[PDB]
Symmetry: C2
Subunit: 153 residues, 2 copies
């Protein structure tokens, strides 16, 4: 298998760790881990194009989109390769994450290794938002923390 | 003209930015940038196997060595792909500027998604005669490290 990990850090209280795991060549990527310091509710969660943090998460670029598609998230509807929908923070401010994805990958042409993982302020409306914005970012608002996705043991 | 960048963040007063640039695939890689907060003198400078920073820099693993070789200097034939000799600091500042055709931002020796580590001590280039020397050049602990990501 191939493994990756990402330490999410930000300007404020938000911080966490996310693990990625791809058991088979271009198979699904198990994504689990936890993020703390978030306000109760939903937070956009995506992979952006650059693993550049010279300017915090801002320099991370737009959502990872190798196949010029619209933003989204839902099953078989159009989307960006980096759109991981939303993570949920309980009342403690901690969001336990456990999702599985078949579009992202840890090897090949949709490789997310060396790219940034971002957790946002608001919820991602998956592109159901009516306004140019919803098809770009899902109106997920600002970025609270991020990290470069790297190869793990 | 593929590019990569790295922000040597993480605990400590040691912060900096290192850019990686490689025009044509598998060709040389130009490495340059600045680091500050360092102790004066020579500091080992290497690419380690993992971009895992969960427990600070201890989780990056050993040097990025895909050919199973002993630690060495970049001009030695006997080196880890990740060995990039030493960087000098004066006030704790070190201006970096190097080339290396063994590492790469594409293919077999891609350092993307891995960790760039600058050590507390000088790297002895693997000529000590002890195990450490053939593993990390005796460069000491890891003052700072950052995962190498894809830059604009
Ligand atoms: Cu995002
Ligand atoms: Cu090292
Ligand atoms: Zn998107
Ligand atoms: Zn080495």
């Amino acid at each position: 298998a191939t493994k990756a990990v990402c330490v999410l850090k930000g300007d404020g209280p938000v911080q966490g760790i996310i693990n990625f795991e791809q058991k088979e060549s271009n198979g699904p990527v198990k994504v689990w881990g936890s993020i703390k310091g978030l306000t109760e509710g939903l937070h956009g969660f995506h992979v952006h194009e650059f693993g550049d943090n010279t300017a915090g998460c801002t320099s991370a670029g737009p959502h990872f989109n190798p196949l010029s598609r619209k933003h989204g998230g839902p099953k078989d509807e159009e989307r960006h390769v980096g759109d991981l929908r939303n993570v949920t923070a309980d009342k403690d401010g901690v969001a336990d994450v456990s999702i599985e994805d078949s579009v992202i990958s840890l090897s090949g042409d949709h490789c997310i290794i060396g790219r940034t993982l971002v957790v946002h302020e608001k919820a991602d409306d998956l592109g159901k938002g009516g306004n140019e914005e919803s098809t770009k970012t899902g109106n997920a608002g600002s970025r609270l923390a991020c990290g470069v996705i790297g190869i793990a043991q």
